[PDB]
Amino acid sequence: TLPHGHMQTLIFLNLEATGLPSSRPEVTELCLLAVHRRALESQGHPPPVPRPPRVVDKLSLCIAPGKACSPGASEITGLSKAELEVQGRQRFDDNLAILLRAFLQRQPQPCCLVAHNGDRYDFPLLQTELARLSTPSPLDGTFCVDSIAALKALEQASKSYSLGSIYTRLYWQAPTDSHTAEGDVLTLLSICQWKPQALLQWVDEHARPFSTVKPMYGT
Amino acid sequence: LPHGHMQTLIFLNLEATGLPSSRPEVTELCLLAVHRRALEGHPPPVPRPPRVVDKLSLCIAPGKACSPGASEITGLSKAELEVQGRQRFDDNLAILLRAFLQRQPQPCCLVAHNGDRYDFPLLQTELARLSTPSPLDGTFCVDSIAALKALESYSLGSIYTRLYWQAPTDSHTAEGDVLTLLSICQWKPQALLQWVDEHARPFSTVKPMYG
DNA sequence: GACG
DNA sequence: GACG
Ligand SMILES: [Ca+2]
Ligand SMILES: [Ca+2]
Ligand SMILES: [Ca+2]
Ligand SMILES: [Ca+2]
Secondary structure, rough: OOOOOOOOOEEEEEEEEEEOHHHHHHHEEEEEEEEEHHHOOOOOOOOOOOOOOOOOOOEEEEOOOOOOOOOOHHHHHOHHHHHHHOOOOOOOOOHHHHHHHHHHHHHOOOEEEOOOOOOOOOOHHHHHHHHOOOOOOOOOOOOEOOOEEHHHHHHHOOOOOOOHHHHHEEEEEEEOOOOOOHHHHHHHHHHHHHHHHHHHHHHHHEEEEEHOOOOOOOO | OOOOOOEEEEEEEEOOOOOOOOOEEEEEEEEEEEEEHHHOOOOOEEEEEOOOOOEEEOOEOOOOOOOOOHHHHHHHHHHHHHHOOOOOOOOOHHHHHHHHHOOOOEEHHHHHHOOOOHHHHHHHHHHHHHOOOOOOOOOEEEEHHHHHHHOOOOHHHHHHHHHHHOOOOOOOHHHHHHHHHHHHHOOOHHHHHHHHHHHHHEEOOOOOOOO
């Protein structure tokens, strides 16, 4: 049975940040890739890496963080507080929320955000970020799900579950453009398309309200 | 230097229900915003995109059906966009576009291929029906066709293949061709910037495609 | 042209 | 572990 009905659109979501949870990191890059459920509802071996649906909305943004990028974040992601400021990137701010709001508003409701390790990373982090704003959270009315739980579940029914490992186990290919918000969100879409009807249903079953996610750290 | 140095280039691409004759409406819109400073052999390797870009890509339900030609080459149709729940070109889109523009240093200059004859007049027509003040007012625009001529057929693909001695990909998706456009524009970035600064014109002076 |  |  379904806790909240059928999610009308899935939003694959990926972030880059200044470091790992222990460093109370900040967002530096954010990608959203909105897909309607019909899009998710395969010939050959190894299985062709699936084409993205023809109809998707994509938002990819760069974000000046209020603190330095740890050296680790800098070398994996290719970003730095200093370069984003050279390119005049604005921070995680009220206008970024209206933007998110308007972007989310264009999607059939309700939404379900899907991030890889989202339960331990992107969600709580996004939650922390948004809590600083005075604009109402534009996420409070969405649902979320962590695609590590999904892939486990799905593979089980037919080992490492990091992004690339799964993508490589599934497709016998290397993921491209790793650690760019968009780059890795696409690879995430690829593995979620592995069994669309099965993932799509696993999502409906496990979706939970974003507002019940705890912030990574406090103010 | 009529309008100072553009701080942001926003490469712009659309899909639509057809060609100007048919009074088209927009079905797909893609914006690729690159800061000025992320723009400052043989055959030349296709250039890479800068690490820092902002991208917005949206499918839009048109009010009129697609012409058979527009469906053919774009893979889109009113019915599909609708059944998949795409909203119209509405006030919220205007609010979204604007929020996106607000994140860039000014002045922004739009860049589109044959934009003076297509995209710009088309967008202006779409935006004139809205109660929101246009988010594009105060922006600048330029036609990458004039740009590429001045720098050197001038179809998008012709140019790409002529500069990089190889084939484009992902045609007639708003994003597919916006990326292509990005490449040929970075063939000679510095020369491009200088020409853009020189020929940029206020979007708000662009006549509507139709009324 | 050259844009869909 | 897995997220940067
Ligand atoms: Ca991630
Ligand atoms: Ca990543
Ligand atoms: Ca075009
Ligand atoms: Ca196109």
